[PDB]
Design a binder for this molecule. Structure first.
Ligand SMILES: Nc1ncnc2c1ncn2[C@@H]1O[C@H](COP(=O)(O)OP(=O)(O)NP(=O)(O)O)[C@@H](O)[C@H]1O
Ligand SMILES: Nc1ncnc2c1ncn2[C@@H]1O[C@H](COP(=O)(O)OP(=O)(O)NP(=O)(O)O)[C@@H](O)[C@H]1O
Ligand SMILES: [K+]
Ligand SMILES: [K+]
Ligand SMILES: [Mg+2]
Ligand SMILES: [Mg+2]
Lengths: 55, 614, 612, 56
């Protein structure tokens, strides 16, 4: 809930929790169209695709 | 009817001449642009592959001298009002001589000569796609005017141009202000205007050249961020990378339950990855193989070869191999010997992987076998070699009477605790263990101290009779064993026996007496129990019993037979109804009844008239 | 912002030069040698096609002069001693300038010039195969040296000799003693000596060019031995020839029961034949032996499925002279024309069966019983609503308002249906005896509507997937009951709630129904069709409960008997209540495996009969 | 049924009415009333099942 997007690897009993990139800090020319949909499905907690994308 | 005109009268008289082969430059373009490529949008796969090769050559030229690598990009542009497409890269480019020695000659490729002068064939041979030299002319399928702006990357070259219309004549001139690289402009035809929208173009770049080695920007936004994880060593990829890749290829939002990373080179070069979905298989899995071939990081679009066995269609992944041959259409040489042995190599590795999973974990494998157990049974049915049958059979799981309930045993584990010299395997079919132990067939076999498997799910009888052998051991069903092996007074039984020989002279062909029953009133035995249980499903009652030979057995100790004795004196009318129901009860207990709706009418008649004394 | 570098800063300032396209034959021969044909034995098929083309050119030249025709036959020999294969014919022949023009040039064929110089497009436009010009070079796959001897048919032409090794250079010289026609001496490569055996060659000839239009021989023994009736008219061909052809295409021994001769050329040229076997469908049944032909040579697609999937039981051959072909002489995958060819054949085959039903009603009845599975499958495996109805007209059912022993279709069922009614009622049962006595039929006996009886399995699924016919809804008897809108009330209700206390675990809701006469109980659910499949579809495959509403007939003796059993034998009454539930469950078709009820059934009769 | 078949799926008779020539009965009348206002006769009547009863 709180520190999912830490900039360093995080381990809890061996496994790692971050497993995601902060696409709002990266340049638009360095992120593909596939990550733009997976990130949306995480923040919106849905299973559909976005019809618009503003960066 | 034998005659021929073959002789040896031919001879040479004059001095022999010499000549060389020519080629017609007009029909060759017509053949390539009309009857070579089946599908139309393959003209940008060739253009992208050409672009990705110029960048590779430039990078190789800037590492021998240790120079700084500039930006490497591939840009796609689509126009609607002008109806044009655009491709641009930043490769080595082409000089004036290179624009005519490569773009002007059919079946001539400059990339082939580049590798021939390397003398290494180690790192660049596996990263260059061009092999034939005719892929550029695929643009003429949808284009009437082709336009190329290119200049070499050499320090001091000049910009040039290249115009043609596919009529065998092309014009070349000089241009000013051309950026280093190569830009190609295509004017779409009247009937080929579908390639002017982002929706159509995006559906092709992703399908064919999604995993190109260099960044690709379509009209401003890139689509080349996800990297190919099937090439590097498995030690470099984490759990998250495996999870992310599966969601893309399988188009699923869940987590894979198994992952395999196969890399072999001694028999043949193979790079592949396989995934097993966690969710229970859907009906689309059964109805047709979720594996796409890749060669040098471009789709091959097989969709008709089935490089993986049909029983292994439930796994998702990709296979990469540079040893497979391809024809002029960039597709497989169908039914080739090399593509046949790859399937056998892949099949044996997958079976071995599942066996190792069972040893590593049993509770996880039990869940997997419950879900995807249908495919393994189908593979045994649709196989030919016994070695193939036995290899798949190791994945089957059953439970036996010698072990506590709820515990599954393998065939090999069962095959380690027989007697000294008994080459027999016993199995019994039943819906539940409650009916398995209470089955009359099992009760007759309690006389021996042996272990028998209990198979519950359907098609188990069909699968076992098709296997027919496991480790040189014969598979014998319990019902087969009972036939093949080799109270009431006697006076009170001989007078009773003649009745059902007459009143059931049509549906019954044999009635005998058997003491081996303790909790069941009657037993029905048939010679070919396995065949009769399955031939009935493929295919009234008199016909169903004529070819069945329903041998019947009785239990003198049972109270039902004891109570039927006085049924002679008091009410002989009810006697005919009761004996008919006993036969039907035994038939259902023997599993030789397709549907019990017919006997419902007689059951109601007996009940409403027999228990009227309450 | 969008990261783009596409601009329009380019300009033209130089001079325009003119150049022509070139081609290197050293690499062009490389492509054809191994990266063109998947199979290795296709070289003989090309040579036979080339030999037949030579004879066609000679024949058309004679009819122009109107003179007698000499012998016309093709010979091929195998010489296993030195490992050579020879093909000879009596064609037109080629001169020294014709050798270099045709043989020495890639992608250039002399047939197209002859075809374009016809100006009628009927004499030879339907019998010339060659259209690419690279067929001859396919022989380099297995040949390390090629010898060609030929003399033209002109009265005075001389022979010539032609040598090549596939290295990009060929040799031409004058030859003496070569007779009219063409002869090709081929020396086999070390790894491809299997073609020196007669058994291997005989397989290929009968596989690709078995139906050539000229007398073909192998070691002097003729191999054609039959004609191609699919190119002829329906009237000249007799039944005996119509019977001999069937035994060859299907590799069968019986006689066909149906025969269709289809010949149309308006949308696209078709000359095809079809056959329906007499024997029952085999286990293997459940290119489908409809192998496509073009110019009397096999195309060997085996994957395009020119015929619909449900039409996998009929035999025959399809011929077309306008199918687009790949450079490797294979059908162009995913073509617009091939899609319209499949649809055209589907309509004609469906129409043919409709006409056969009207002409012979009894014959179609026997045919329906044998191959009924395929028709039902096609309805389920269809996507268009119109095509589903086209297949639906072939179905045959039995109605309640007619005597036993006759069948009626659905089209005439709607022609005898009342104007107010706008739906069709159907009932599922093994036999008509079990259909009339089924409780659901007796519930709907009040009205005067007509209900069809369907016996064979998956009939309800076929109707469920169809759901429409002539814009009339299909509603089963089971569906109509739920949507429809002596055991005193005090005695009944108090005993009625007793069932709830002991059957509430399974029977969620329960009521009393009075429209019964002989069935002591019923079981009804909302989605009877889905439940009768879903409860059986789950138990079939381990892949991806319900609310059984049980009805009680108060005027039945068995139900009336339970009134005086609660006070006397409460323990035995519970056994009878469960048995009644099982009996009604079986008659509804939703029962589980009946092995379970055997144990409970036996335990009831052992105690209930303990009084005599 | 011939003239209102598109809009009416079933017609019946009620003898309990004496002051109204027409009556419409729906399975879930309360749910239909509130759901209709939030969301021409053909597509509306498809989701309402407007059974028609006429007092003779
Ligand atoms: N965009 C480009 N930039 C620079 N050189 C190019 C480009 N496209 C093509 N070439 C050169 O022109 C040659 C002819 O193109 P092409 O027909 O694609 O041959 P190929 O790609 O190497 N073999 P193929 O697999 O049939 O495409 C190539 O081999 C390159 O040397
Ligand atoms: N046996 C022959 N007799 C006479 N002319 C021949 C013979 N073989 C070849 N030719 C000629 O040589 C040309 C080249 O042969 P070929 O490669 O078969 O071209 P094609 O048959 O016309 N087109 P294709 O369908 O690819 O075979 C033919 O078109 C003929 O004109
Ligand atoms: K080229
Ligand atoms: K030629
Ligand atoms: Mg290329
Ligand atoms: Mg030819």
């Amino acid at each position: 809930k709180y520190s999912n997007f830490v900039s360093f690897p995080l381990y809890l009993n061996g496994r790692r929790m971050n497993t995601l990139q902060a696409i709002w800090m990266m340049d638009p020319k360095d992120v593909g169209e596939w990550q733009h949909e997976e990130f949306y499905r995480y923040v919106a907690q849905a299973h559909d695709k976005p019809r618009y994308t503003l960066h | 009817p034998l005659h021929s005109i073959i002789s040896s009268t031919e001879s040479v008289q004059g001095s022999t001449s010499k000549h060389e082969f020519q080629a017609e430059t007009k029909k060759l373009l017509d053949i390539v642009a009309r009857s070579l490529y089946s599908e139309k949008e393959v003209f940008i796969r060739e253009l992208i592959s050409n672009a990705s090769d110029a960048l590779e050559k430039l990078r190789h030229k800037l590492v021998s001298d240790g120079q700084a690598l500039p930006e490497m990009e591939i840009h796609l542009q689509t126009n609607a009002e002008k109806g044009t497409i655009t491709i641009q890269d930043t490769g080595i480019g082409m000089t004036q001589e290179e624009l005519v020695s490569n773009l002007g000659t059919i079946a001539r490729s400059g990339s082939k000569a580049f590798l021939d002068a390397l003398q290494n064939q180690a790192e660049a041979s596996s990263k260059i796609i061009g092999q034939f030299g005719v892929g550029f002319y695929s643009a003429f399928m949808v284009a009437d005017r082709v336009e190329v702006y290119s200049r070499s990357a050499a320090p001091g070259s000049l910009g040039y141009q290249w115009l043609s219309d596919g009529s065998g004549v092309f014009e070349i001139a000089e241009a000013s202000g051309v950026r280093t690289g190569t830009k190609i402009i295509i004017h779409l035809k009247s009937d080929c205007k579908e390639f002017s929208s982002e929706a159509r173009v995006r559906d092709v770049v992703t399908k064919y050249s999604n995993f190109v080695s260099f960044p690709l920007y379509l009209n401003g936004r890139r689509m080349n961020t996800l990297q190919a994880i099937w090439m590097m060593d498995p030690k470099d990829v984490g759990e998250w990378q495996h999870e992310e890749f599966y969601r893309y290829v399988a188009q699923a939002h869940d987590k894979p339950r198994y992952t395999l990373h196969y890399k072999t080179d001694a028999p043949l070069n193979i790079r592949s990855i396989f995934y097993v979905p966690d969710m229970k298989p859907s009906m689309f899995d059964v109805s047709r193989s979720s594996v796409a071939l890749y060669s040098r990081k471009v789709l091959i679009q097989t969709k008709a070869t089935d490089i993986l066995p049909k029983w292994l269609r439930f796994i998702r992944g990709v296979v990469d191999s540079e040893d497979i041959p391809l024809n002029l259409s960039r597709e497989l040489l169908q039914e080739s010997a090399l593509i046949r042995k790859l399937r056998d190599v892949l099949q044996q590795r997958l079976i071995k992987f599942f066996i190792d999973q069972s040893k590593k974990d049993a509770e996880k494998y039990a869940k997997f076998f419950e879900d995807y157990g249908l495919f393994m049974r189908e593979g045994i049915v649709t196989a030919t070699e016994q070695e193939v049958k036995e290899d798949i059979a190791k994945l089957l799981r059953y439970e036996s009477s010698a072990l506590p309930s709820g515990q599954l045993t393998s065939l090999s584990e069962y095959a380690s605790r027989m007697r000294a010299g008994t080459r027999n395997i016993y199995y019994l079919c039943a819906p539940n263990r409650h009916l398995a132990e209470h089955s009359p067939y099992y009760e007759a076999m309690k006389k021996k101290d042996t272990e028998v498997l209990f198979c519950f799910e359907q098609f188990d009888e069909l699968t076992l009779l098709h296997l027919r052998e496991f480790d040189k051991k014969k598979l014998i069903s319990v019902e087969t064993d009972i036939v093949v092996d080799h109270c009431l007074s006697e006076k009170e039984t001989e007078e009773l026996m003649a009745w059902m020989r007459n009143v059931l002279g049509s549906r019954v062909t044999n009635v005998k007496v058997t003491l081996r029953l303790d909790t069941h009133p009657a037993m029905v035995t048939v010679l070919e129990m396995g065949a009769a249980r399955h031939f009935l499903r493929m295919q009234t009652q008199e016909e169903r019993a004529q070819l069945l030979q329903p041998t019947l057995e009785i239990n003198p100790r049972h109270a039902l037979i004891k109570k039927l004795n006085q049924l002679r004196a008091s009410e002989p009318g009810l006697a005919q109804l009761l004996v008919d129901q006993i036969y039907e009860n035994a038939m259902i207990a023997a599993g030789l009844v397709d549907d019990p709706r017919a006997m419902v009418g007689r059951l109601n008649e007996l009940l409403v008239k027999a228990l009227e004394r309450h």
